[PDB]
Amino acid sequence: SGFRKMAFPSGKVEGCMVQVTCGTTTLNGLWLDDVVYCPRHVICTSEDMLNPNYEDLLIRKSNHNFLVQAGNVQLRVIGHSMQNCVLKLKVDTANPKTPKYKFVRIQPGQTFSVLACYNGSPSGVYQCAMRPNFTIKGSFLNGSCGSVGFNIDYDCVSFCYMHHMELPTGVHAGTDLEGNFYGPFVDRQTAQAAGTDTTITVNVLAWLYAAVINGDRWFLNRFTTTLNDFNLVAMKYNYEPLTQDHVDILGPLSAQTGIAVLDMCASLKELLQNGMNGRTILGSALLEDEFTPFDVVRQCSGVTF
């Protein structure tokens, strides 16, 4: 037993990370088949980022200006193009380590693993969630751009995130692998502020089910509630509204534990209104919202890849 914030094994993605340098700027790229994907602001200087015209900046870049290095070995760039906010660098060699993969655009509230990299080299792996304001709370230093987020289903890597930007408030913004930012953010160094960071209610409920499964159950009470009543409290506490779709997704955890979803909502309601009173749940003193119901089922059953 036990329940931990767990990332996917990163080996399959490690084999895809390369370094990309354009002029004075170095960041990471993702090498799949014979294409390397990276943030288009690899072509920008620090000065350019204040007001970049990417189409004009790109005119001055040729294939040989994109230095792509896989480990100690250089890759030959035979073509390049811009798609939304990513560059696709065509190389003359297909990555021999390419896994089965897909590109996916995830919804707010979904979780994924991040492989933080610098200079094409992996530094660490950790679990994130796409927040309801379309930021993520990661660990990204200068040079981490082009690090990616992903999920694995058996043997297929679904890439869903590429890192592009840190907002002045310390949260992070990026794109899917087609180059489209999550949320309203842009790859300009300007005043863009995140909206309310609402809590992912369905994920909190999943995690309470995980706690019950793993022994922590002091928060279970004698009450129930309704969706509408619960959501009156959810709004007050900046929780996402809970929908019938969410209730349906929690069904399997409800069945495993015998605790009806609305009963667990009543437990969550009391936790919101009364606090933890100095107690903990699965080693946490706040309500964790970066485990999905699918995450809980997966970890509690031992799915492998």
Add this chain to the structure above:
Amino acid sequence: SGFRKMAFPSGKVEGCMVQVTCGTTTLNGLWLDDVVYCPRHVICTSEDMLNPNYEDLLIRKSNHNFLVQAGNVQLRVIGHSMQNCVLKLKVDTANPKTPKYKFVRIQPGQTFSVLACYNGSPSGVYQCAMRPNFTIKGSFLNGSCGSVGFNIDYDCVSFCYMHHMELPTGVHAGTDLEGNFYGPFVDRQTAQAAGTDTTITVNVLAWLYAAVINGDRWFLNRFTTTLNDFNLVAMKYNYEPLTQDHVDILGPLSAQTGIAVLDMCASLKELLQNGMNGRTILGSALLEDEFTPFDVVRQCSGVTF
């Protein structure tokens, strides 16, 4: 910026995980060069675990009784021996993916990454600490035995843990890669209880430095203290005593931030005596103690492998 509970990239260890089956019991083994390491209780039935005599049980096992499978391919076992609480299975093929590696026995308070596996297949990666009572708090289901914990220094994997047991209280116990349990635990299904789970004071202080570096500093105050005074409070709150050795290890974080170590101790003292008052530090409502000073420096600087 940002600070996350980060594990090492797991690729190098993924390439070493195999399945080991003896009779009706299947768990994981670690394949390095031409040796597979696994828990000796792979030879036990559930009944045997109540009072096993491993030397006697092993007499009935031959090389061909240890079924070792690497992916879809079977390995040939040409010898076996027991060393403390692990078996070493000699196979006729050296693992072609063997990384540079070392075996290390870690001290309480040191952290490491765990690659949770089932049937030789990786499930997920997460960060742990060797607790002061020589347990770890992991995520281990039936079949996870033989999963390992490790650190990476550039290109060399230092293996420090192999999973063997879950105590009735839900915490976990295991060995180094020479087969010696951490702490007083044994591979018998009996009444063994963990001692006090004291908090790793030096790690909490490291994490407060990480918070300051990453913007969270409301807990900084106008006070200082001394080692002896601080430790009077540490004892009351079941914190490890802070030593001059610990102060020395925190020196580099002290220098980066300009906050003297004893000043940070005074901040921690007030946090212990007054609580968080409903505030958070790096997204946590309790004081995190599973980041080492070396972890903080590493993550805040972007070390790669």
